[PDB]
Design a protein around this ligand. Structure first.
Ligand SMILES: N[C@@H](CC(=O)N[C@@H](Cc1cnc[nH]1)C(=O)O)C(=O)O
Ligand SMILES: N[C@@H](CC(=O)N[C@@H](Cc1cnc[nH]1)C(=O)O)C(=O)O
Ligand SMILES: N[C@@H](CC(=O)N[C@@H](Cc1cnc[nH]1)C(=O)O)C(=O)O
Ligand SMILES: N[C@@H](CC(=O)N[C@@H](Cc1cnc[nH]1)C(=O)O)C(=O)O
Ligand SMILES: [Zn+2]
Ligand SMILES: [Zn+2]
Ligand SMILES: [Zn+2]
Ligand SMILES: [Zn+2]
Lengths: 389, 389, 389, 389
């Protein structure tokens, strides 16, 4: 016998496939971590040493891309005891996350981009796909090489920069600082082949999106590189976000915020307003703290976010909102890959990566493939982090 | 016999107690530097090896908290010969100060935060409680670690930052500098578990509080973290301070300034205006120089402040103003502890620290306990600094 | 009734006390986290609202002090996936550990003293007692303030410095760099009130202890500040370690190494050698990686150390080594506290901290108290880390 | 029909395979740039849309790996006009080179690691595989991040460091500087998953290898991380090089030097000396200047090295040296990949990268495949650099 096992041939048979586009019942051929063929009825013997998988009666869709996760831990708003813990592989996979963008938040004193970068690498090495944003809430940005442009341009996992605005925990940056930072990300992105975005954590300040508007009037960074996140945190901010998207910007809704605008609600609303789903993404904020502040900017309560809200949002949208599953998936898949220009991700096409979700019809996760590898079986991780126990 | 002396049991019997709230005649049980019980009639044998103290006919109240003292010396406005000297322990205790916040002023060239920090530690070790502010008049701030946020976040004794505005000795900072500095203090405070305030020395400039208003319009720092000090220095500034407090800010009156608005006068006025005492504090400016300047910003005269004005203010308020003692005490006790979130200080409650003042009925200090230890006896220090002589 | 609960009075009765010294049957009284009385037969009613614990039939001893723990995680010798996780509270308490000293190892790129410091602080807040060493294997040391000397003098929790010698992962330092470093720690120590020690991770190099000796002739740092650790990792090193202890040095044996010199064996050998137990300590290296390198410095195997070996060593010593329980506890209690000058630790005496272990006669942990708080009950943590699962 | 082209299936049939091991007549199947099967007689229809290549009568072997190439240009020893040009893709592929390691030489003023890195990245994108060494002749090293150790641990393409010793253009470094540097590369290597080697350009100094030996006694870096290059440049050096290899070291012979020790001659001598071929590598120094200096360190002659000598050496060895083709290829394939720990390179095994050469029986290159892509056809590049003419 001849051994063709190195190929990792895998045939995924007869699931109802959402690419996210409804492909109906379709097969998927995988080799070396890549989708090599997608079509109705694939001869299970088309290739040697092929592992056949019957997904009849099941749904197949692309793995989620969570562009907002505190991979190394976050928190700290109430002292050191509130420093959250690092993210563990199985937590991600089990929630259907095959691709992630790690970032830092409030604390950039006991939290470092070098550590975030190491964790990002560990995850890629463990089996999934991971990137990161340089910077943190603090502006000017705390980087690895000393320059935002140089970080985005030269650190392979860095794709953009993070900052915070309209929030009582910001560093009170002025327009110039913001503009420059954005411009540097923009430029380091062309050079490095990164999207070069700037992600803005939004707080509850009444100024809302103003800083983003000001910034626009003060530089030549395309509206397409700027991402306001946690837009559902408050009404008036949410409403502003809608017009921002309508002007051509993309807005990121956080799944970990149920009030005042719940995730599925925000998405449905966007759509009511005429916003194209391609301009709406959804992220978890996993492992970040969920601190609530007083009227005096006083902390009262503090929790930690998880990844389960992702899937839940989908379910709700489908289930309580009348979205088609296809539509329901976009913001976690194709919309995100689109905004971040994440190649080979977000869609089920030949040549793309074999990052797939096998779900039951009532949208429950059974299996997860990350780059062609079986990570989750029967809704449970079969592959765990080097130190998960 | 069994030895239970390690406990330092101390029963303080039958004084009329102001917590600052009028508790009438009440006893106070202390152990290991802490108030363990407060109630009418405590069995002098409730605990073993208990030291009983009869304060019948006397008043008992909490130790003062002076949040504005040049612990290492200050001055310098008229040359090196005008560099004031360091503060000595007994000077504090004798004036009823059991808790202090050290800071720097005009000179941050021959004066250093590292020195201030060492002195702060020496004082805690000698018997009282001491903290400090990083920075000085100079903006941008001269810190220990190179960053305001990092100092507040990581140096255990640092609780906030100092600066000067509306004064001919300021560094002429612009709104951005101010805003950022404040924001950094704010944020380093959450992380470090410090109040994270910004204290503004106010000069006589006609702009008065404007800079604070501007700052507000340019960042998201809660009005509750900003403290304008020496507000009584001039009328129009004083008047502005009143509305600032009324908007929700706290104002600090300096006891060492008799004109144009004397300390008790300012406090009474605040109250006439409807300001809650919780939003009014009083500090000494002890060891700082008291320089007076010309019309041409020319120095004429220069003196050095002491701590006796603290007690005097209380006396006057009670004596010439009709405040209840309870009310009279707030600004030196509960109001200060409240603003700085100084835990276990400012009030007489079980679990709080045994920082107490024993006074005669005509408000004269007889004894002082700092953390359960007898520091002053019969109005005189029994415990002196390592080098006091 | 009068409320005296703020005192947390606790009376631990009837156990067989090892302080570590054998004190036969004897009671212990606690108030405010401190030991206030130690005597046979204390009256269960000597003080109000007392919680009495019947320890009859049990054994009572000081909590362990582990001076070598990778609090924020370690490892990374085989890439990013081998970066070990941070330490959880419950894992320490459950191992009998009430005081700990945190440090960095091989990686000081993705690992930072600022993060280590935040963690040390987190643990102090959560209930135990933590300190840290500045630096890492890398010499020159990477510090918080930019100076070893400054780090030790001004960062409250820093008590000395870590470095690596005689190991293929060292930074190839020369005596000058080592001497200067040790001298800085010594001096910072005097200034800040710290022991100001230099901790040397020893590797398998044939040079063994040579560098230390060289350093001793190139400076005037007292031998008593120089701590070689992991001395049992190889024989010739171990034997050299005995001479060094013999000359006045203290030596730290790693409980996580079972070959070629088992921990209990090392201790017994030290003693048979005429080295007083005061000059022998034992530490775990918990959370650190346990990497194995072949012939050509190639990594063959990697694992993570836990805390169980601490206790095990004690059992073995008593059991197999003819040791008295008293002597057997020294190396984890009094010797350590003595070496690092840890006040209020390692010994059960009035005035010390209520850090104690309740064990069965066969040496199994049952209860653990930290600063008088119950952390472990029935061999199980009843107090957990803010983010423990 | 079903489309399976995303797979790039390619079946290379009938050649005489040297993997390098002689495997007689044997086929090779490729999919997605990887070798998925290696066996005699694979079925031309085993997989769909297969491109079958008749290599009958040819020879198939691994692509060459050149670890010493001045990718961005070099030279400059005789002023600015002698700065050599950057390497073009086609020149590498055409020389049989599929993997390359880039470095700097004498000039690190007009030459920068950031530029070298961009180039390495350009080549990876264009189709081959490239890595780089940080540093240059200059010691201390000029780096990207400011630290050798950091450069190696965090810049993905950096795998070690370059330096110059025993040469009149060295920076006159001392053992400490050398030892520290090598130790940093070693450690960064472990952290980032790199070999973490130190590459020593050797010059004609009488000191020859002394510095290496000195370094070995001043540190604990494994001999296997230390690569002396250009060892054939002079005799006594060369002879010393044999002893070093004999002690466990690996040695790099330069194909661009024909006197006094020809490349093929050096290799044969190494072997006759008992040095396994695994410890002998051969590199070109392509694009580097070939300067000649007279008596008094005066430049007499300058030229630029090409890549043709690589192949030539192989031919000569076989031809004139009694070598088997197998052995003759080691030094450019398996030995190199082995030394630098290059995974998926230097050997034709299922799972490795499809980097292969098609040669005539007389050893002339015909085709070249890189990661399964056809780059050279008929001895001519059919793939060129984005800006190649
Ligand atoms: N700050 C957290 C991460 C974070 O942004 N959380 C959100 C949670 C939230 C959003 N809206 C209300 N709460 C925040 O606004 O704070 C950290 O730094 O980990
Ligand atoms: N500057 C002094 C401390 C200080 O602020 N004193 C006050 C005294 C004052 C207030 N109003 C009039 N005089 C000042 O306004 O100068 C130093 O630096 O020691
Ligand atoms: N490397 C660890 C800390 C450390 O010093 N471990 C020792 C463990 C050991 C001792 N003997 C064998 N293994 C080592 O020699 O590696 C980290 O950095 O986490
Ligand atoms: N100098 C070159 C790189 C380099 O090391 N070349 C060797 C070439 C050589 C070896 N023997 C004779 N000539 C040198 O000794 O000069 C550059 O910097 O481009
Ligand atoms: Zn956020
Ligand atoms: Zn976040
Ligand atoms: Zn002032
Ligand atoms: Zn002052």
């Amino acid at each position: 016998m001849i051994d063709y096992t190195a190929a990792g041939f895998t045939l995924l048979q007869g699931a109802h496939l959402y690419a996210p586009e409804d492909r109906g019942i379709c097969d998927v051929l995988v080799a070396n971590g890549k989708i090599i063929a997608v079509a109705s009825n694939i001869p299970s013997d088309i290739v040697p040493n092929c592992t056949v998988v019957d997904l009849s009666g099941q749904i197949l869709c692309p793995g989620f891309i969570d562009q907002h996760v505190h991979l190394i831990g976050g928190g700290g708003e109430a002292g050191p005891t509130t420093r959250t813990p690092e993210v563990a592989l199985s937590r991600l996979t089990e929630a259907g996350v095959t691709s992630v963008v790690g970032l830092l938040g409030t604390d950039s004193i006991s939290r470092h981009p070098e550590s975030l970068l190491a964790k990002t690498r560990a995850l890629n090495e463990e089996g999934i796909s991971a990137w990161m944003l340089t910077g943190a809430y603090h502006v000017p940005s705390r980087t690895i090489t000393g320059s935002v442009e140089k970080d985005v341009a030269i650190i392979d996992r860095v794709i953009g920069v993070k900052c915070a605005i309209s929030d009582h925990r910001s560093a009170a940056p002025d327009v110039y600082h913001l503009a420059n930072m954005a411009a540097e990300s923009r430029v380091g992105g062309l050079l490095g082949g990164k999207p070069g975005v700037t992600v803005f954590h939004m707080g509850d300040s009444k100024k809302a999106l103003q800083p983003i508007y000001d910034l626009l009037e003060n530089c030549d960074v395309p509206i397409s590189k700027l991402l306001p996140t946690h837009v559902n945190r408050n009404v008036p901010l949410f409403e502003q976000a809608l017009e921002f998207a309508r002007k051509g910007g993309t807005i990121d809704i956080t799944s970990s915020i149920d009030e005042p605008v719940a995730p599925a609600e925000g998405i449905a609303r966007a759509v009511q307003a005429g916003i194209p789903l391609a301009r709406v993404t959804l992220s978890s904020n996993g492992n970040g703290s969920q601190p609530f502040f007083d009227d005096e900017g006083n902390l009262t309560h503090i929790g930690v976010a998880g990844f389960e809200t992702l899937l839940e949002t989908v379910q709700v949208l489908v289930k309580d909102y009348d979205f088609s599953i296809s539509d329901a998936l976009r913001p976690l898949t194709s919309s995100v890959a689109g905004f971040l220009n994440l190649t080979g991700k977000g869609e089920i096409l030949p040549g793309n990566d074999a990052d797939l979700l096998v779900m039951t019809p009532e949208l429950r996760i059974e299996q997860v493939y990350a780059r062609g590898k079986l990570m989750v079986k029967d809704g449970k991780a079969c592959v765990k982090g080097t130190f998960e126990t």
